[PDB]
């Protein structure tokens, strides 16, 4: 009961969140895999920034905040980083100094701090990239100055994919009694989140949890899942032989399994037998993932 693994899905929608740049007026999208096709990715640190923004939104005191200032990207820090503070997002970071005062403010905490109790991984579009593009025309020219932009107008390009994508994450039960409410707030933020995409006014979609399929175990942060579903989402077949006989034949236990939206499928005869072992009677992901907090955490 000292480790938690999970993978979550989202609803299909047109894509966004360009990262690369090119003079050719095309905002390229990051890609990784070469199995004969191409996929799209979303880096995890952007989602970490979104989590920090949401913990800003909810009522949790934290010492890091982003400010809009001179064109250099900047974020002020005010008080020195400290383990014993209402701040947990401000807890994760570690930064070195040439001076570093007198032994890190005279032996109060310790500068190089662990990553976090939370660990994540990139997302995969689970749908091959397609060469479709969208074409738009941006006129930038004024007849009365008013500090206009570049003189000549231009025509630009974007690209977009209609897909949905998933990513795994995990955490450990090393230190949880010290931060019960912090973990509760973090889980509440995970249950539903906003942003994580560069383009707000265009191509709006959010990472609403489509399915959660994992639980806690005293197996010392080990797993069996491959962290990948099929196109339709009914991945449980690759784990069907893993879940049907959870009680016997040296198979992974029933306590490790859950159900999100896929459990609401029309067929229910096998739901009766899976309910005889696993606790998966949850249809709404939010209620289930909130209920998981009480079981996983000390309280």
């Amino acid at each position: 009961n000292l480790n938690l693994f999970a993978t979550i899905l989202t609803y299909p929608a047109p894509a966004s969140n360009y990262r690369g740049e090119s003079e050719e007026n095309r905002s390229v999208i990051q890609k990784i895999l070469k199995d004969g096709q191409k996929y799209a990715i979303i880096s995890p640190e952007s989602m970490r920034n979104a989590l920090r923004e949401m913990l800003i939104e909810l009522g949790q005191p934290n010492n890091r905040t982003r400010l809009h200032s001179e064109d250099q990207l900047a974020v002020e820090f005010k008080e020195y980083p400290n383990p014993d503070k209402f701040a947990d997002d401000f807890l994760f970071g570690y930064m070195v100094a040439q001076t570093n005062d007198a032994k890190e403010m005279k032996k109060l905490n310790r500068p190089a701090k662990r990553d976090s109790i939370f660990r994540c991984n990139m997302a995969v579009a689970v749908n091959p990239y397609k060469y479709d593009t969208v074409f738009y025309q941006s006129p930038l020219n004024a007849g009365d100055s008013a500090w206009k932009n570049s003189t000549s107008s231009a025509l630009l390009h974007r690209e977009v994919t209609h897909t949905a994508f998933q990513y795994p994450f995990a955490l450990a039960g090393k230190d949880c009694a010290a931060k019960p409410e912090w973990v509760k707030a973090l889980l509440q933020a995970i249950a539903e989140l906003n942003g994580v995409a560069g383009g707000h006014a265009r191509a709006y979609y959010e990472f609403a949890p489509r399915s959660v399929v994992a639980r806690l175990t005293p197996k010392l942060v080990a797993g069996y899942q491959t962290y990948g579903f099929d196109a339709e989402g009914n991945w449980l077949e690759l784990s069907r032989l893993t879940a049907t006989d959870s009680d016997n034949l040296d198979l992974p236990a029933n306590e490790f399994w859950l159900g999100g939206e896929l459990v609401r499928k029309m067929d229910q005869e096998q739901k009766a037998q899976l309910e005889a072992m696993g606790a998966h009677l949850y249809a709404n992901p939010e209620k289930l993932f909130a209920d998981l907090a009480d079981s996983f955490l000390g309280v």
């Binding site: 050719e24 095309r26 060469y131 390009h157």
Partner: protein
């Protein structure tokens, strides 16, 4: 001669388009400098239009669909067969070859 064919077809295409738009046989331009200026302006307009048209689309089927339709290559009566049979790497390389050939012709 492989790449020489690409160079010749690009040069012939730009000359044919320039002749369709405006009178051909550049040697009639002769002394009047304004004729050279307008000729060069039309030349560069056509060339950079084609440059943008080929640059924005360089992805497999769409690239060849635009390339074969809007360009007029030579006859290559029987030597064309080898040019057709190795079409995959042919396209993969002639994207760069055609871009270079088009970029080569500016005033």
């Amino acid at each position: 001669e492989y790449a020489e064919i690409v160079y010749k077809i690009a040069q012939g295409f730009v000359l044919s388009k320039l002749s369709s738009k405006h009178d051909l046989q550049w040697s009639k331009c002769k002394g009047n400098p304004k004729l050279e200026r307008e000729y060069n302006d039309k030349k560069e307009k056509v060339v950079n239009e084609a440059f943008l048209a080929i640059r924005s689309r360089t992805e497999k089927q769409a690239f060849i669909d635009y390339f074969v339709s809007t360009l007029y290559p030579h006859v290559r009566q029987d030597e064309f067969v080898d040019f057709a049979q190795k079409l995959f790497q042919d396209t993969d390389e002639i994207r760069s070859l055609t871009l270079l050939a088009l970029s080569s012709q500016y005033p």
